[PDB]
């Protein structure tokens, strides 16, 4: 009745870090939405 259009599952294929994931590359994480990564004062004791 209606023309097929991509669903969520069809879209999830294009959301990986790389195309055609493998065992070695399965652990790769896609870069953050903005290209900013988490970043993850000295003391002195002048004695006698």
């Amino acid at each position: 009745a209606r023309q097929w259009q991509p669903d969520v599952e069809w879209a999830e294929q294009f959301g990986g870090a790389v195309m055609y994931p493998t065992k070695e590359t399965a652990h790769w994480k896609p870069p953050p939405w903005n290209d900013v990564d988490p970043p993850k004062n000295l003391t002195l004791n002048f004695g006698p």
Binding site: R2, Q5, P6, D7, V8, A11, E12, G15, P32, W33, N34, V36
Partner: protein, 320 residues
């Protein structure tokens, strides 16, 4: 001459417009607390500009005409349905929260643009900061899932990592039973169903996380219901304190130029509010998206650019 790199190059510097009175201030309180009246009094007394709390159709008031559009064409959510069945099967709660946070982000961008362009201060209700507490309550009451709060955290980080926190945060503290009494006295049938657990959760999420986290970069003025009645003392406290612990003293002319270029062009302000992470509460099908976009296009003054709509009454189209 629309503001840009050339305007900054020639004459336009926003540091000379600061007259120690801008002092962006947000006013925060529980549901049906007297935060709005206090904020309005502060704005009137200090000569600043008041911003009414962002609603479902706040964005509709700033584009085209001020008349709000249809619910399905703008927001696709309602607070009344959230109050009636907060555990709705269609995920209306998180859709409501995400739309509200995006509207708050747009309002914050507008306020920052006004402050940077005119120098006049701005007073706000709940901002992007304090927008999380409701989410937390909606998480703890079982209204939304953990994926919802994860997506909210991602969007909130990726958006709020680019703005300046408010100079002073004003908090009004009111016991939960008094708030319930005010809810009963209001008369709106939808708000009578708010359970004491939900209000308690919001009030607890306020004190537990908000206050300590912004006491390290902003100046906090906690007030009770009785002492918030008089705006004289609040304005006196505002004028007496001096801000030197926030990021604002570290800003200069180039940082202000970057922030002013950021606050304008709202399309990039809202760019990360639609990141391609598919949560069933917010994702929309292709057919529905096409139909709703087509309906939005058929609106009177939305087919073309604002100055190129013949049905609205714009003339000299062929020569603009």
């Amino acid at each position: 001459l629309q503001y840009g790199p050339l305007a900054f190059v020639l004459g336009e510097r926003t540091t000379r417009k600061l007259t120690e009175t801008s002092k962006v201030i947000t006013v925060d309180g529980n549901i049906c607390s007297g935060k709005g009246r206090l904020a309005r009094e502060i704005a009137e007394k200090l000569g600043l500009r008041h911003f009414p709390e962002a609603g479902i159709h706040y964005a509709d008031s700033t584009t085209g005409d001020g008349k709000p559009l249809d619910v399905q064409l703008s927001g696709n959510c309602s607070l009344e349905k959230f109050y009636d069945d907060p555990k709705s099967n269609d995920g209306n709660s998180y859709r409501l929260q995400s739309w509200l946070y995006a509207s708050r982000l747009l309002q914050y961008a507008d306020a920052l643009e006004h402050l940077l362009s005119t120098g006049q201060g701005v007073v706000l209700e709940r901002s992007i900061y304090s927008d999380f507490v409701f989410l937390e309550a909606m998480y703890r009451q079982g209204f939304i899932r953990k994926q919802c709060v994860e997506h909210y955290n991602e969007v909130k980080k990726v958006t709020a990592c680019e703005y300046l926190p408010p100079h002073v945060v004003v908090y009004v503290d009111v016991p939960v039973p008094e708030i319930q009494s005010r809810i009963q006295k209001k008369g709106n049938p939808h708000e009578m169903k708010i359970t004491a657990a939900y209000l308690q959760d919001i009030e607890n999420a306020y004190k537990k996380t908000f206050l300590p986290e912004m006491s390290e970069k902003c100046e906090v003025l906690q007030y009770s219901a009785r002492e918030a009645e008089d705006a004289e003392k609040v304005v006196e406290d505002i004028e007496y304190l001096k801000c030197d612990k926030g990021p604002w003293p570290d800003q200069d002319d180039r940082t202000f130029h970057r922030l002013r270029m950021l606050v304008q062009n709202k399309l990039e302000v809202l760019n990360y509010t639609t990141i391609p992470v598919y949560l069933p509460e917010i994702t929309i099908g292709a057919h529905q998206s096409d139909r709703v976009f087509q309906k939005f296009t058929e609106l009177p003054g939305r087919k073309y650019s604002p100055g190129y709509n013949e049905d609205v009454g714009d003339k000299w189209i062929w020569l603009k």
